[PDB]
Design a protein around this ligand. Structure first.
Ligand SMILES: O[C@@H]1[C@@H](O)[C@H](O[C@@H]2CO[C@@H](O[C@@H]3CO[C@@H](O)[C@H](O)[C@H]3O)[C@H](O)[C@H]2O)OC[C@H]1O
Ligand SMILES: [Ca+2]
Ligand code: NA
Ligand code: NA
Length: 487
């Protein structure tokens, strides 16, 4: 092993991933996993091949990852949401939409079956929705038009009609929160900064793909963007990013996440405080702040973004963002403590079972590979593989539990032109070698073979490193899934 981690270092849980970017995260908790959906941050380039600042040009997909344990993330690839203009090579799902910013996700049981709803903003001009029968698709655009526009009753007055947050209440009623921006264009007055009156909530119809009644204004002090809703001990918490302009009081610091409470999902809301500083306060610089609060496996968390991967690569964040998660703490009086945003993140919640099929694109740390949609036969919805594998690259999972009896063999589904090796090591990239899988020539990068090799000395709980070697260039092999067998 020679390659180094970009930003998510071994033993740390933030950023969640560093093999690509992901902005504007939101969480779905479903059947023992947390799924994180993100804006598709992706580098823009000058004609000479140098990086330029993020202008959101590439925000036409939604990236999805998931975890059972907060450390190992399965990469589920990209949903080609936007279908207008150049978007997604003709494969875009929403043909009316040129962009898919800042997703929100909801699940609702309808007629005995769980149904999934992905909301997004078509830049600052409207909100769309896609539907699916699984959290990872495939996705349908049932309307063919935005769900919410400036003509939707109650939505006049919104400056940026974006950043949706959809919440399904305990009674099954969905609510859509959206909006932001500050009125007054290039020069808002102090009062316009203080009360933009651009946040909205509208009730959804039972089917989650329509609205009922009119939107209500939420008078979030110093509103900017990034609506969020969570419910704690019977109280509704509307959270949002506080704006950056005008003078601000000590209790409404610029660019931080503010929150308000109500006994009802549509208000009236009362400002309570703020609980997440700007990512720049923790990681350097500054930029936009986007978050979602959720409860997964009986703990409260917030997912947010920071420029921690781009900064590590370039020495400047340049507006390119990555997901992070940290614990969020409610006090006895219902107030929320400041979130201690950091790199350590959340300690692994549960071990990984290495005796099931585990996708190769399910990993905790890597140095340095890519993931992409796979040609491998079978596999899960939108199955990916690990690629851009060169000599000395590696991936690792956290806390695989081999059990007392341990492992007998290791299987890997691989495709390779010239061949190579996968070393299976415990604890560290140079740790105990328990097996070496010889990747043969399979006939090419799209011709797949499941290879089996011996394993010995793999018992108990360990980080597991898969270290890639070979003499060729460039791509040694593609790697789809693996599975150990029990001794
Ligand atoms: O076309 C519109 C976009 O331009 C608009 O982008 C917003 C631009 O401001 C961003 O917030 C900045 C974060 O960094 C701070 O230092 C700055 O003071 C902020 O202005 C915001 O996150 C973007 O959404 O979005 C709406 C589009 O219609
Ligand atoms: Ca796979
Ligand atoms: Na969001
Ligand atoms: Na590589």
């Amino acid at each position: 092993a020679t390659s180094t981690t970009i930003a998510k270092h071994i033993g740390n849980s933030n950023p969640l991933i560093d093999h690509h970017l992901g902005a504007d995260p939101v969480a779905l908790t479903y059947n023992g996993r947390v799924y994180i959906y993100m804006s598709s941050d992706d580098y823009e380039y000058n004609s000479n091949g140098t990086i330029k600042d993020n202008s959101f040009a590439n925000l036409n997909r939604v990236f999805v990852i998931s975890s059972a344990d907060m450390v190992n993330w399965t990469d589920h690839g990209a949903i080609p949401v936007a279908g207008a203009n150049g978007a997604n090579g003709g494969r875009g799902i929403a043909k009316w939409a040129g962009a898919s910013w800042a997703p929100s996700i909801a699940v609702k049981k309808i007629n005995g079956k769980d149904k999934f709803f992905l909301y997004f903003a078509n830049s600052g001009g409207g909100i769309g929705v896609l539907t699916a029968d699984s959290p990872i698709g495939p996705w349908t655009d049932p309307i063919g038009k935005p769900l919410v526009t400036p003509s939707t009753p109650g939505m006049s007055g919104v400056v940026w009609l974006f950043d949706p947050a959809v919440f399904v209440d305990d009674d099954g009623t969905g609510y859509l929160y959206a909006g932001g921006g500050v009125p007054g264009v290039s020069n808002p007055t102090q009062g316009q900064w203080a009360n933009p009156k651009t946040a909205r909530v509208i009730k959804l119809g039972p089917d989650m793909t329509s609205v009922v009644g009119s939107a209500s204004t939420i008078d979030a002090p110093f509103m900017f963007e990034d609506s969020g809703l969570h419910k704690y001990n019977g109280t509704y918490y509307y959270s949002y990013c506080i704006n950056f302009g005008g003078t601000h009081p000590a209790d409404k610091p610029p660019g931080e996440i503010g929150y308000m409470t109500s006994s009802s999902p549509m208000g009236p809301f009362t400002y309570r405080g703020h609980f997440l500083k700007n990512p720049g306060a923790f990681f350097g610089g500054g930029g936009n702040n986007h978050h979602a609060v959720f409860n997964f496996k009986n703990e409260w968390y917030v997912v947010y973004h920071a420029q921690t991967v781009s900064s590590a690569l370039f020495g400047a964040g340049k507006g390119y963002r990555s997901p992070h998660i940290n614990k969020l703490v409610h006090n006895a009086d219902g107030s929320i403590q400041e979130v201690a945003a950091n790199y350590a993140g959340v300690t692994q919640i549960s071990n990984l079972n290495p005796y099931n099929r585990v996708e190769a694109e399910t990993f905790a740390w890597n140095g340095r590979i890519l993931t992409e949609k796979s040609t491998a036969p079978g596999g899960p919805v939108n199955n990916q593989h690990v690629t851009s594998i060169q000599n000395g690259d590696w991936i690792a999972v956290g806390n695989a539990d081999f059990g007392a009896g341990g492992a007998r063999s290791f299987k890997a589904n691989v495709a390779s032109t010239l061949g190579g090796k996968i070393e299976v090591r415990l604890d560290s990239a140079d740790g105990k070698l328990v097996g070496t899988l010889n990747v043969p020539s399979t006939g090419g990068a799209q011709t797949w073979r499941e290879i089996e090799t011996a394993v010995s000395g793999a018992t108990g709980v360990h980080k597991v490193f898969f270290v890639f070697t070979g003499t060729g260039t460039g791509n040694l092999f593609n790697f789809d899934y693996w599975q150990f067998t029990q001794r």
